[PDB]
């Protein structure tokens, strides 16, 4: 059945603007997942999950007895999909049980260890996501088998669809480099927002770079895609000795014995796949990703031997039985255990990835001191482990449960803790009246509160207002913010804040944070008086203040706008048209389609613009907060060609007599062209529509300032 | 960007199911477009179309000074992409406008039409949807011609995204029969559900079957799509003759000269497409479809002149400027118009498929009457173009304004008014313990009140529950009704009514059609009560009973389910997987993906499946209302293999013991094998959801009961 997307390839699409509608869900409106979990008894999940240990099914039997390596295996590729670049992937939407995680190559036979879970699942029903389940479960296996977490917080909520993600254009599971649609370019340069290697996988090729087993050159992967997964040379380090001090790999046979993926098995599979034929198709037989090493002579305990041994021996390339590259170590004695079978034991094994700990450099000088120092290696470890499963969980007041972690920790963003009486409706009233009193015009305060709010992505919930970030580095220096008109905005909010905090009596004080968002309040509401409207902008107190030494330079950049359609802002130029880019940063702010539109068309005539631009500013009373942009849009009267000078610039010239009215950009003129938004902007430019328009402005400015305020969920 | 479609094209496509979401709809929750609509003033709007008919734009200006002829084809468009099959397409949503529709090559040049519109629309705001104003638009062109229309109504309410419809598998538009998705086979057979003869076609090729210009075996392909379009022979006949009274075709050069459909132009398009490079591009340099064809001497006027020609004059076959096939009368003096200058004059010309009119032995027979009688002729296009144009519209309580016919149509499966009072909840009470005192049980009660319920259809708004149907030709016969089995429950039914009529005082009484329904509900209540709960379903009176003299047999025939996944039924093998016709009958039905998984799980256990078939009765209380089907569909201890005799259905065996548990279809296991659904299966199959189970399925139950309810809005 030939659709849209066949006849027309490179329309935007806007339908991952409405994924996770009310219809897709089976829950009620008014589930709160929270408030479900907060009424769990999760010391009673942890009894079962720690039973189940040592549960073994017949159907995917226990290796050594125990699942806590596959359930550690399970949680780490739950977590380990997370890209800084966007925030997407991670852990924190339960997304490996949908397509197409679930069937990932790096994936296989983690169905079997979801399927294992059910029975909780079930038991439990709502109380617990899936989401929290898969982290919930590899903290069990950690702490079963000896090792001491850091803690836990519950609060991811389930999803019920895949998310939209680009995961890389090639065609083919686990291409190498250099093929048609190639993630690499140059000097091993990985295109962003990509973080792993080859599609399908996590993050690295066990074997080493597009399978050429050289421990030096993995390094390089591993320091590149862990760098884009967050994480720094000790976390790296830690991470990787800590998990392969638990289990082993699976390759007993051929892979070509591996059948289909779950979404390709037939409908008898039950949701499985990656059945094999490879004699009992399980357990001693198993076969997962082609590697068999077993790293350990404890594989189910917590235990110093990774670092002893990987110091200890001297390795040897050799080939697994299914045909992979891997080590084993030179004249040793069969030490290792057999995981099913007691009268056999086996030579230490690595990976390539995991020589890479020794042979590079600077990661031989962490090992080393983990080596000498088990102490210093299993608290890294713990703090680790604790980051990869709750990178993308946002601020700290989302964490619930009994486990939390009470330190607070630089990557969480944080933002202190209020301890003073707020601004009330009175004082927001007075606050608003010396905001407009000092000059600042509609433009420079909806400006600032703009730049301020809108860093916020859901896909891992960093960024927004919350903090006055805005005011420290990076984000006061960024090309969108306007560094200079900001510093000045700044300093008058500053001086307004020192005045009014200055005359309070009892402890009563406003942050610079809650008054940046105030003013842009203000802004809006002067812009409405500007066109005739009376309208009062909601405006919720309870922001703080970070400093600079709370506030991670080189994790923030991550966060810097390149592309902000809803300022006409495009830092350079880009592979990806314009309203792609717009329609992505939608997404992260978490705006349906006509909440972008009323978003986008309202900003433009209030002065949003970087640069005090003309591109899109279809009105001739500009700061006042009408419908103009959509009404003189759609105006048939009006020619539009695209300039000489730059194809991606448009004039718009009076179609009777040739005279110049306006000059937008392709996200300007993407209103008026792609069908879809042009019906919702028809809406908004119709004559019964300036109150609505109004309306509605107000209502998404008020969400975009509020995206953070989980302190208020 | 490489996506699950991509990865896994033959995976069943859920998305379909949440198309429609709030997220996606410009207006408010609350916004009602009849509300809106009853407050339009219509003859303004009507007086604003009579003078835009009239006012010529420049970047497209009028044929001979009148936009009517094009109009007119711009509304005919709209309502015919209609099919009886599935009731998809017709202008009941507006849906010319986006995707693909908007681009179709048919549909050419209807985008300067739409555009034209544009400053009604926005004057006029909410208050009337493009779905119904495209169709207005077109019976105020013919009024202005000299045309008495037979009525209009309003209520088409505007969508905001593509509908998803099978229009065929070519990947080439306008491909010629017999290629590698040919939609045609045998004899000339073209695919259900598909009624025309081309991608991208309305209905047939006007210069006659894949370019053949043979009127007769032309003739064949209009009898055959317009009867998929639900248009019988003399229909057909006033509809084709009445349209080419007005206007022309456009073909003034080669069609090379045409560039992109609108899906496909550059944003400076701003909407529009097949910009021309043929001399200035517009009005008399027109090109549309490269016919070059005026059929009449007044193509601004109302006239009997198409037969006049038709039948005055000998043909002769010609060519147009672009090259396309056409006929011209050789022996006639010049009287045809010119569209722009006065001082020229052309012969007649004919399409090959108006000749068919002429030519087909039984159309002519048609065609000579109306040449006769043009009275007879007026009368005949007038309802057959509100036939037409209301088709899909659905019940005529949904009909909105002061233009509406009083005359009721037997095309319309119209229910005699309700004259009487109707029962309270205390007769619904008494009726429903009657009907349970009967010995009727919850299965019989459960799959009647299905079978009546569920042959509505959103995508035309025909079928339901009123009128009692259920009760007459042809649903009494339909296989997937139990003929039999429904005969014995009629009979108990309808002998309750006599006796609640006859005692009753005052006029009250209940007809067949309510309680069916009622009686369905009494079923569910006690299916509730068998397992342990207490529930009332709601039940809403008011149906009334339709006699067969008021119901069209030929057209019900398009309502028989053939295959209804909800009652484990297929009535023939098909091509398409059978859990693709289940997300297809949910589609129709109205349901999102979490309402049809409930509905499904509880039919199967309270005994609804066709035949008393055990697939997918995975319960040991049968006529009890829990959620055992998701229970044990999801039991891991149960394992599931496709049948020696049967692939398509499944044995479930303990896989400890090989003991034989439950036998299941695809659209069974569908619910343990699709990653959404079954995440939705979980949901309603954990320890904490027999609550929340019965809930919900009482009230997608209710949903279904109420489908065709449009004397409730
Ligand atoms: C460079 C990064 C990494 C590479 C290339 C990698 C590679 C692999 C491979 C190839 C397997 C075998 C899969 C199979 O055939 O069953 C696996 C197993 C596993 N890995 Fe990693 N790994 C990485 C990082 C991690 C991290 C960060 C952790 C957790 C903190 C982790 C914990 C595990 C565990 C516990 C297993 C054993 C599974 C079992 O017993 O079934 N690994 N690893
Ligand atoms: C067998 C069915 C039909 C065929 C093959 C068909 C064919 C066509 C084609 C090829 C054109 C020329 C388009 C262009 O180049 O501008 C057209 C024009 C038109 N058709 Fe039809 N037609 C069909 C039925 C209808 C019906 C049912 C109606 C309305 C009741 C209709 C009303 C019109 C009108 C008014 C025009 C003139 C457009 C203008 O003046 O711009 N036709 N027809
Ligand atoms: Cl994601
Ligand atoms: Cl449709
Ligand atoms: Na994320
Ligand atoms: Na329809």
Not at 184 to 198: H, I, K, T
Not at 273 to 298: P, Q
Not at 350 to 379: C, G, V
Request: hydrophobic residues 40%.
């Amino acid at each position: 059945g030939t659709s849209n997307r066949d006849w027309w390839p490179n329309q935007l699409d806007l339908s991952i603007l409405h994924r996770h509608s009310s219809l897709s869900d089976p829950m009620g409106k008014d589930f709160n997942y929270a408030q479900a979990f907060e009424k769990l008894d999760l010391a009673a999940v942890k009894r079962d999950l720690h039973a189940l240990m040592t549960t073994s099914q017949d159907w995917w039997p226990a290796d050594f007895g125990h699942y806590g390596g596959l359930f550690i295996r399970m949680a780490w590729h739950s977590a380990g999909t997370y890209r800084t670049a966007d925030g997407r992937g991670g852990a924190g939407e339960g997304q490996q049980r949908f397509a197409p995680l679930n069937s990932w190559p790096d994936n296989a036979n983690l169905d079997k260890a979801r399927r294992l879970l059910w029975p909780i699942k079930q038991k439990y029903g709502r109380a617990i996501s899936w989401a929290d389940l898969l982290i919930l479960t590899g903290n069990v296996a950690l702490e079963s088998m000896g090792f001491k977490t850091f803690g836990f917080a519950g609060g991811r909520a389930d999803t019920w669809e895949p998310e939209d993600v680009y995961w890389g254009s090639e065609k083919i599971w686990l291409e190498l480099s250099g093929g048609p649609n190639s993630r690499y370019s140059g000097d091993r340069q990985l295109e962003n927002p990509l973080a792993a290697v080859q599609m399908g996988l996590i993050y690295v090729n066990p074997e080493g770079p597009d399978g050429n087993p050289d421990p030096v050159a993995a390094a390089r992967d591993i320091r590149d895609t862990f760098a884009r997964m967050a994480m720094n040379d000790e976390e790296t380090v830690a991470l990787i000795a800590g998990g392969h001090t638990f289990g082993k790999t699976h390759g007993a046979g051929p892979a070509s014995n591996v059948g289909a993926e779950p979404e390709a098995a037939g409908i008898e599979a039950q949701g499985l796949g990656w059945k094999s034929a490879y004699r009992t198709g399980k357990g001693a037989d198993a076969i997962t990703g082609g590697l068999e090493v077993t790293w350990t002579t404890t594989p189910t305990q917590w235990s110093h031997n990774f670092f002893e041994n990987l110091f200890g021996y001297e390795w040897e390339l050799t080939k697994s039985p299914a045909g992979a590259h891997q080590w084993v170590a030179k004249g040793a004695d069969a030490v290792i255990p057999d995981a099913f079978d007691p009268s056999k034991k086996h030579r230490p094994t690595m990976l390539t990835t995991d020589l890479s700990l020794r042979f590079d450099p600077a990661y031989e000088k962490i090992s080393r001191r983990f080596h000498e120092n088990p102490e210093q290696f299993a608290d890294a470890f713990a703090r680790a482990w604790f980051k990869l499963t709750h990178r993308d969980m946002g601020p700290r007041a989302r964490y619930l449960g009994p486990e939390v972690p009470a330190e607070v920790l630089l990557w969480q963003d944080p933002i202190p803790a209020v301890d003073h009486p707020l601004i009330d409706a009175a004082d927001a009233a007075e606050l608003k009246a010396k905001v407009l009193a000092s000059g600042l015009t509609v433009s420079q305060l909806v400006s600032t509160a703009w730049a301020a709010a809108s860093t916020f992505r859901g896909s891992d919930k960093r960024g927004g207002a919350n903090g006055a970030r805005i005011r420290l580095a990076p984000q006061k220096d960024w090309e969108a913010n306007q560094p200079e008109q900001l510093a000045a905005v700044l300093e008058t909010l500053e001086a307004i804040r020192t005045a009014f905090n200055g005359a309070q009596r009892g402890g009563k004080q406003v942050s610079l944070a809650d008054l940046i968002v105030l003013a842009g309040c203000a802004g809006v509401e002067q812009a409405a008086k500007n066109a005739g409207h009376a309208v009062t902008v909601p405006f919720a107190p309870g922001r703080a203040d970070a400093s600079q030494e709370q506030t991670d330079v080189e994790s923030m950049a991550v966060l810097e706008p390149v592309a902000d359609g809803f300022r006409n802002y495009l830092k350079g130029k880009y592979r990806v048209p314009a309203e792609v880019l717009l329609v992505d940063k939608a997404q992260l702010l978490t705006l349906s389609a006509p909440e972008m539109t009323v978003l986008l068309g309202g900003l433009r005539v209030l002065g949003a613009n970087v640069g005090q631009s003309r591109h899109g500013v279809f009105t001739a009373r500009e700061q006042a907060l009408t419908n103009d942009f959509f009404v003189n849009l759609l105006d048939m009267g009006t020619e539009w060609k695209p300039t000489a000078a730059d194809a991606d610039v448009f004039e718009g010239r009076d179609r009777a007599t040739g005279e110049l009215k306006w000059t937008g950009t392709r996200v300007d003129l993407v209103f008026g062209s792609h069908s879809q938004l042009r019906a919702l902007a028809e809406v908004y430019g119709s004559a019964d529509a300036q109150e609505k328009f109004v309306r509605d402005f107000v209502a998404v400015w008020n969400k975009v300032m509020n995206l953070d305020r989980f302190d208020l969920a």
